[PDB]
Amino acid sequence: GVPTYGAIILDETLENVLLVQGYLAKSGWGFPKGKVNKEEAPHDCAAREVFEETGFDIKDYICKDDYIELRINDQLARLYIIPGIPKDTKFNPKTRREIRNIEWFSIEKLPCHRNDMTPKSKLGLAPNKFFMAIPFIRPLRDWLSRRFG
Ligand SMILES: O=C(c1ccc2c(c1)OCO2)N1CCCCCC1
Numbered sequence: 001g002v003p004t005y006g007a008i009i010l011d012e013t014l015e016n017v018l019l020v021q022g023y024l025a026k027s028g029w030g031f032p033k034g035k036v037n038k039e040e041a042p043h044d045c046a047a048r049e050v051f052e053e054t055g056f057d058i059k060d061y062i063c064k065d066d067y068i069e070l071r072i073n074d075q076l077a078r079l080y081i082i083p084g085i086p087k088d089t090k091f092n093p094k095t096r097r098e099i100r101n102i103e104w105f106s107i108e109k110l111p112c113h114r115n116d117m118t119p120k121s122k123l124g125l126a127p128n129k130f131f132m133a134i135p136f137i138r139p140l141r142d143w144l145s146r147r148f149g
Pocket of ligand 1: 004020021022023026029030031032033034035098132
């Protein structure tokens, strides 16, 4: 799989994160990110995808060492961590054929796993609208604990 790059944008209080909602196969909420172009550097791809999906330019704010990276079914996803972005910032996606909505969410209220169906004696997991975000939540909380306490 081709690697994806994007960002975790936090507000000034460090309580809230910015998620985007896609369409169809991507119909739920996730961090902004997308596939790298041939010859494109990781930091440039992250700024390009976040700008297409949110209208906000991160280029002057990226720190090269500050990111969370996960491998999900053999595709690598790297999200640069971007704190301190005010909640009154005006976000407007570029690619509105791909992005339904853009909203701030409370980090303490977001799930860090889906729920099972053991009350129904049935295997698998119940649907969750945060499915794309969920794998990053626990690693984010651990990262913020260490850097900020
Ligand atoms: O998370 C993604 C995404 C981007 C590229 C992908 C992908 C997922 O899976 C395989 O290639 N996006 C894109 C727009 C939808 C809302 C969330 C952000």
